[PDB]
Amino acid sequence: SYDRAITVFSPDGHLFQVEYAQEAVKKGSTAVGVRGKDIVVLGVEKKSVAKLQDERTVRKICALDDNVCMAFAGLTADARIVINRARVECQSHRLTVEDPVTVEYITRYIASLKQRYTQSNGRRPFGISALIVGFDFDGTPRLYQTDPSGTYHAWKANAIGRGAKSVREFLEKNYTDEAIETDDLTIKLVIKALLEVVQSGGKNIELAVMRRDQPLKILNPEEIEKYVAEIE
Amino acid sequence: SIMSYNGGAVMAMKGKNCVAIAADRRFGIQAQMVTTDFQKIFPMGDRLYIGLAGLATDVQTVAQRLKFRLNLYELKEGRQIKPYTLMSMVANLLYEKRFGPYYTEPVIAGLDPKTFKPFICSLDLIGCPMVTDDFVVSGTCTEQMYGMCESLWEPNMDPEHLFETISQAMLNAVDRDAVSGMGVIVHIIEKDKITTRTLKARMD
Amino acid sequence: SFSLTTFSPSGKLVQIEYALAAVAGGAPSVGIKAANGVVLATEKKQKSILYDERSVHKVEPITKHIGLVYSGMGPDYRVLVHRARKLAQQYYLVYQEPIPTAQLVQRVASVMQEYTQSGGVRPFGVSLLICGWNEGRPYLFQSDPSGAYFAWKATAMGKNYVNGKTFLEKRYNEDLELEDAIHTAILTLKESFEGQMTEDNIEVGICNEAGFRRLTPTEVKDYLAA
Amino acid sequence: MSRRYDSRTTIFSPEGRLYQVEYAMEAIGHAGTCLGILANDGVLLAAERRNIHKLLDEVFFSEKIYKLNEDMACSVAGITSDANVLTNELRLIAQRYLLQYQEPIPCEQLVTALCDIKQAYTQFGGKRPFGVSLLYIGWDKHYGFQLYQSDPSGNYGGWKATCIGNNSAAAVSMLKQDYKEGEMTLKSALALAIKVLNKTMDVSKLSAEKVEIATLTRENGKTVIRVLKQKEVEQLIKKHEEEEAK
Amino acid sequence: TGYDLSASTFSPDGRVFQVEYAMKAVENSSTAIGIRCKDGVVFGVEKLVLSKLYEEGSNKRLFNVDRHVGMAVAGLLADARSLADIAREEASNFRSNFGYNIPLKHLADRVAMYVHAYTLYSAVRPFGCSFMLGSYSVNDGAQLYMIDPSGVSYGYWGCAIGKARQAAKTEIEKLQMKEMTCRDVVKEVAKIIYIVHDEVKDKAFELELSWVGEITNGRHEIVPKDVREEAEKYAKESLK
Amino acid sequence: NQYDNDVTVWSPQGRIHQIEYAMEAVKQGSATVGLKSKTHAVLVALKRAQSELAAHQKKILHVDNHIGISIAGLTADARLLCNFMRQECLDSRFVFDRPLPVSRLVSLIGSKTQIPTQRYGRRPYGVGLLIAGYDDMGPHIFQTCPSANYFDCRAMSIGARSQSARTYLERHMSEFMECNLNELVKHGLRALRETLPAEQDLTTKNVSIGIVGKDLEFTIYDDDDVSPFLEGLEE
Amino acid sequence: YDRGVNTFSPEGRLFQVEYAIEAIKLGSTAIGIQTSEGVCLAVEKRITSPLMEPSSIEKIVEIDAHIGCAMSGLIADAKTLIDKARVETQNHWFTYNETMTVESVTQAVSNLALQFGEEDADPGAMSRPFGVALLFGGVDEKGPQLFHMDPSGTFVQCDARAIGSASEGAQSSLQEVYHKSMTLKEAIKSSLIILKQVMEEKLNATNIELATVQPGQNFHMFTKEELEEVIKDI
Amino acid sequence: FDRHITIFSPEGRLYQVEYAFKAINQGGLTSVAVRGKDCAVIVTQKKVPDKLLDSSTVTHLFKITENIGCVMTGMTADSRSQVQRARYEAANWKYKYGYEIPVDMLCKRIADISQVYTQNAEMRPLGCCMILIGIDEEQGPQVYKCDPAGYYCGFKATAAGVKQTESTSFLEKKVKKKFDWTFEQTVETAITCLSTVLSIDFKPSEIEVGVVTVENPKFRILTEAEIDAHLVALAE
């Protein structure tokens, strides 16, 4: 087999391999997500295709379970492996425990994989950063972000991909108790969070929402334009 | 034994340029009967079929591994498999599992994929291929099915005779058996087409 | 335990690019598919008169209906003989039939694909010509070090293959008899090989309805009348 | 052992990309020009043959066009050796699917199954990645007629029309311009491939031998796939032969 | 040039430098000699005194492989102690299988298989010590073989290894060692080492002798203190 | 240059520089000294604290009732051999119901030390081990090396600034055999004086010892019982 | 890159491990405290944005009722070690039916840290050392015990040890203020004074986390009640 | 880079394998062998650097099986390794197929073992060429030579070592005359070859001569006393 260390230290202590991994995270498309009041909403920009691609495989907003969904920004390659093996854990947790999955329980097992891939022999750190968001028991939503390094955080409003820091500046300034008040204001905030990094993109914004007991629902392009129609 | 657990029977015959296959539809557990709608014969593609009897589990199991390895051979080579070649596949498949053997009595009948040339054969519980150009019978009523066949079998008969022949064969034979009966499916394999008929038998 | 084959900035495979460069630096080899049979002609060059000719042959049979030739590193061809022969027997176990030419060369080239991928193993420095007869259809295939097998009515390889292909652009016609195709391949190697032309230096074999049969130097001497 | 000669594909560039994957896309561009079209009546597939010689034979059904299963097929542009590895793995995944559910595998499921194997070597193992780009056609019970394109990095996506290999920038540009979305079907849109394959080929007088065309259409509840007759494709080119005059 | 960076890489002149360096590592070791005669095989080892703090008998270079097989080593000491256990476990597996003591020709050959196995790959390194394997049996008699970093067996009537080698080998050639008896061999072995070593870098040393042959009843045995000092006094005649 | 990369590469002078630098790391740390008489053996370990707020590191690792060891070198590298040495001593009394001989244990430890050396990819152990033990033949002082070499010594001082310590040990070596347990500790602690500069010399706080004897099992003393051991001695 | 992991330096040091201890200088400043009446550990959360929740991030977690934790540098490296540390801790009570001593906690962690290696091992082994500086406190029948651990893997009983970026001047400052019998409440005082001085941000209940362990009171995580009191009682 | 390990050179060569060919040549020993009508003879240089060395302890003629002899030329480190590995094969042949291994398959299996050294980059080629002899009931005397690259072929007259170039020339001069093949007179040709090249007139202990015959399929080593008889008495 192939056995050697990949990521090694540096004279300044920083990790060459891991920093280049987070660099590829920023090179990907811009994805955003927020934790609403009674709901959760995800969104990601779409590079504009010209009259070709099908939106079934292109959709970057997936669902790990009925309780928890996710989005990703980075290399599309490593994203599909995490989505598959996380859904396995969701069914394995229900197989082991009759109680449903917990957003914090599933999130840690995800980022824990990327930590294993970093320190394992011959493996590689992923170039993806995923937003794990879902509903806990009693209906309390939770939004967590992963890291190629294996850490995970908690975020009320979050933005990933290209210009993630630029949108985060719009977040911290315009995020207040006025934000994510209602299902409408939560979605309009996600749209406005994608309006800074958009250059003549227009309709390219696609949205998704999960409402209480119901599972992730994809807003139709016309339903998206309904909330996009109000800008000024 | 376990071969008589689910019962059932499969019969196949050969005409001049054509071959015939018929089997009972009964599915049950020992003395208890369950349903008469079971299918013991599966299509192998053009001009080829395979019958199965014995334990009903291995009938639905081993037959599923067929099209698995069959398609892989049909995808690599641009031709369909020969019935003489398919016989070696089932005999090799049973002898990978030989140690804790599947329960079934395969029946293979068809034509030369090359043209019109007919070929028939049957296998054994342990996977021994056996080539008989006359007829093959398998099941719990086997000993009862022989005398009917061998008496009414002839080397060369048109599809018209094969209709009544294997029919009258199955009818009186399957009668004396307790665990076989209640509907019969008949498959007739011609050169340019295939005839499939249903027989009216005593419900017992 | 690591594969040394990497992608060049132009996209080419550097290790396999030099693999064929070793094949072109070997002895010339040609083949022709015409009429009911396929001929393969190779040139065996010793380093002196002190080495036995009949001891080691370049033309080797695989099965009854299939045979192979080569130009390149000698020892690398001996590995393929064991793996091709053993593969054909594993075929005869399952399907109880002789192996077709298309099925053989496929998985034989897969061995080339494995060692251009699995780590710690260099690619092959050989290129083989595939000769087979199945169901009345003559089969002449050409394999490379990378593992890509094509179909050819006629082909030339080894040394001076450019002039060998030029001869096949003219001397090779259709509806050509197998016997005339043998003498045609001799005219192709007439310019390439120099010095003393004998029946022991040239090694020719054919495959037809009767199966793959290697030719003896006595029979070749009659075929050298041109 | 000799870490001096270890290329370490898993290492990221200072630009945040992969060395081998970036050079893999260029190697695909050197290959032959291949295109595909998703229409209403079915899928359309056409491929140029860059190998041109008087001694060529091609005893097989087609060169760059292969049949995955009953309901699906594929094309290829890239390294010709690693294509047979991916073709076999697609036939293994599709048949292992038939074991459990006893049903034909949908188009999207078979594509994403191999792409996990493609990028598994870029994730670890130290073995070189695959330089093969594959086009996917077929029909499934739900989504119906589908056309898919794959990349050597493991990424993929759906496409209504696309092109792979040489002349990718010119062909795809010429494709979109006249492409009729959900409108122009097999009969009509088959004339576009011949029109595009003549423009993509720098040598004039497009020959029916230098190209290959195969279609897949499900009719009367049965999937039908065939390789178009070269004698008819010539007459299909005879259409394009009279197109510039009239 | 970088051609010496690994043992798996051959020199453009067709040499293996890593194995040659292992022979040069033996040249750093102290001088050790051995001689075989009719009665048996006699061993000797120069034991360098690095400091007075060492206990008498410390840094023992005489290894007991088996009942009839002794060994003396020159090179890296731990590499010899590691191989000594390999040879002991090998001779033990022999008697556990075939039910008798392994002959010297068989043991030295299988040990050389382990020595050369480490010269083949790039994942390991050759042994940095060259050693001698003596044996005595009523079926054979006095037998002496030598293994090198390349793992090759060399039989010798008399031989020398360590730093000073060629000088001690010539002195052995000046006198026939086969006619003499083990009682008189320890006299010359002691006299040679006094001639081999002079005081320049190292300060003091001691004589370590070993006996195998008929006098030891076919068993590897160290020299007794009484006879050793007696042979040294006869060797001090050349010093005075 | 290019010969320092790994253990397998030999220098043109026939020397492995990785093993050479393995012996250098031993000189980079606390200096310990030990000695044996005809009856009792003592291991004097010098405990060093990084700062005054942090306490002193533990240089003594208890092995068995008849066996003890002091460590000088890279700290945590001795933990692997510790748990191994303890497991080997337990397996001896678990099977033979007998304490493993001191000379036989070190021969087995020197084997596990040498195995990773020649095999590429395995780091050689960069910690030196001074081990003592008592048996029917009396006490024993065995000093080891990262090269896996081990000797038998009356007294030995290893570590940084051990030069003047060894010189003290050589001249007084004749007394080390005939002195009793009390005088062994005295001259053993005064030997530790030469391992440190003229400013900070010795205290009962930073110096711990251990002893093994005829009827006395190996014990470890740190502060309490060490105070009367040090005091009453001229330096 | 032109060097190995286990390659020795001419000065007798490891290239790999030396940069480990060199890497921990970028971590978060944290200090442990050992008092006669109990053990006290504090850590700076170092929150990079108000949207990031300081309550979810925990650099002090409960292994056993006696033993706490500390984290610095890369957070996930500590989480990997604490996971197996909590498994072997319950494996102790699963056998001996008693709480694991503070010493046996670090012995299990020191074994897991020393196993670092690449070749001649399984893929499930950790290849590179952790960039975390560990502080394991606790109180048992033996009394309060606080241990320090670095990427080397050693554990030593110490009254107070500073970790993180400010560990240079903090460890010398912890020496000066802490002496003799100084207890819990008096320790929190000098703790929050030195920490607030070295870190950039001002002291707040949500900017740092604090927890203590006592002989009679097991590990108790300070909520908004206890945190807001000790910051204004400084 | 290509000059160190085994990878394809830009010209198609293999330098790791070619530097091995110079390693066999580096041994400083020249070996010759000639296949006669009824016999096959091997004559190699037997060197004794010091008188303290012993004769029977160092020998270049090894026995793979009873009916097959073996001679080795190169650095002796690689010499003993192949012979033990060859005996693990020739003996295994009888455990499976139940008869003495032919010289054809013995050279094929040993080559395959050497072919892995070239194909697998983890290992290295071996620095000794192997010349295997023997006899079969069909082709009679068999003489093959296996290089570390893995190539082997039937050689009527073969040579190796530093003088291989000059040795091959004199072997051609004898065969060019259609030299009549008899047992002992062929033994002269192999000995006179090395005798005329170096211009020495070797002593009986300076050469090592193996023999195999139709009458004696078991490999034998020519006695040094019989060597002296056919050196001095017959130089003619």
Q: The CATH topology of chain D is what?
A: Glutamine Phosphoribosylpyrophosphate, subunit 1, domain 1
Main sheet of chain D, how many strands, which sense, barrel?
Answer: 5 strands, antiparallel
SS strand fraction of chain F: 15-25%
CATH architecture annotation of chain D? 4-Layer Sandwich
Structural class of chain F: alpha+beta
Main-sheet strand order of chain F equals 7-1-2-8-9
Terminus-to-terminus distance of chain D: 69 Å
Proportion of residues in helical segments of chain D: 25-40%
Output the helix-strand order of chain D: HEEEEHHEEEEHHEEH
Total helices of chain F: the number is: 7
**Count of all domains of chain D:** 1
Give the end-to-end Cα distance of chain F, rounded to a whole number of Å: 46 Å
Chain pair sharing the greatest interface: E-F, 37 and 36 residues
Query: How would a textbook summarize the main sheet of chain F?
Result: 5 strands, antiparallel
Descriptive keywords:
part of a larger assembly; 8 chains; C: 226 residues; alpha+beta; Glutamine Phosphoribosylpyrophosphate, subunit 1, domain 1; 5-stranded antiparallel beta sheet; 6 helices; 35% helix; 26% strand; globular; G: 234 residues; 3-stranded antiparallel beta sheet; 34% helix; acetylation (chain C); Proteasome_alpha-type (chain C)
Task: Describe the protein's topology.
The structure is cut from a larger assembly and holds eight protein chains of eight kinds.
Chain E: H1 17-26, E1 32-36, E2 40-49, E3 62-64, E4 69-75, H2 77-98, H3 104-120, E5 129-135, E6 143-147, E7 153-155, E8 158-161, H4 166-173, H5 182-196, E9 204-213, E10 221-222, H6 225-239
Antiparallel strand pairs in E: 1-2, 1-8, 2-9, 3-4, 4-5, 5-6, 6-7, 9-10
Chain F: H1 17-26, E1 32-36, E2 41-46, E3 60-62, E4 67-73, H2 77-95, H3 102-118, E5 127-135, E6 138-143, E7 155-158, H4 163-171, H5 173-178, H6 181-192, E8 207-212, E9 219-221, H7 226-230
Antiparallel strand pairs in F: 1-2, 1-7, 2-8, 3-4, 4-5, 5-6, 8-9
Chain G: H1 15-23, E1 30-35, E2 38-44, H2 75-96, H3 102-114, E3 134-140, E4 143-149, E5 156-157, E6 162-163, H4 167-177, H5 184-198, E7 208-213, E8 220-221, H6 224-232
Antiparallel strand pairs in G: 1-2, 1-6, 2-7, 3-4, 4-5, 7-8
Helix pairs in contact in G: 2-3, 4-5
PDB class: hydrolase
Keywords: proteasome, PA28 alpha, PA28 beta, immunoproteasome, hydrolase
Entry title: PA28alpha-beta in complex with immunoproteasome
Write structural notes for this entry.
The structure is cut from a larger assembly and holds 8 protein chains of 8 kinds. Chain A has 232 residues and is α+β, with helices and mostly antiparallel strands. Chain A has one domain (9-232): 4-Layer Sandwich (Glutamine Phosphoribosylpyrophosphate, subunit 1, domain 1), CATH 3.60.20. Chain A is 36% helix and 22% strand. In chain A, the strands form 2 sheets. Chain A has a 5-stranded antiparallel beta sheet with strand order 9-1-2-10-11. A 5-stranded antiparallel beta sheet of chain A has the order 4-5-6-7-8. Chain A starts with 15 loop residues before the first helix and ends with a helix. In chain B, the strands form 3 sheets. A 5-stranded antiparallel beta sheet of chain B has the order 9-1-2-10-11, with helices on one face. Chain B has a 4-stranded antiparallel beta sheet with strand order 5-6-7-8, with helices on one face. A two-stranded antiparallel ribbon of chain B has the order 3-4. Chain B is globular, with a radius of gyration of 16 Å. Chain B has one domain. Chain B has helices spanning 56-76, 83-96, 142-152, 159-175; strands at 9-14, 19-24, 27-29, 32-35, 41-43, 48-51, 107-111, 118-122, 135-139, 184-189, 194-199. Chain E has one domain (1-240). Chain E is globular. Chain E has helices at 17-26, 77-98, 104-120, 166-173, 182-196, 225-239, and strands at residues 32-36, 40-49, 62-64, 69-75, 129-135, 143-147, 153-155, 158-161, 204-213, 221-222. Helix content of chain E is 36%, strand content 23%. Chains in contact: A-C, A-D, A-G, B-C, B-D, C-D, C-H, D-H, E-F, E-H, F-G. At the E-F interface, helix 1 and helix 2 of E face helix 3 and helix 4 of F. Strand 3 of chain A pairs antiparallel with strand 7 of chain D. It is classed as hydrolase. The entry lists the keywords proteasome, PA28 alpha, PA28 beta, immunoproteasome, hydrolase. PA28alpha-beta in complex with immunoproteasome. Chain A is Proteasome subunit alpha type-7.
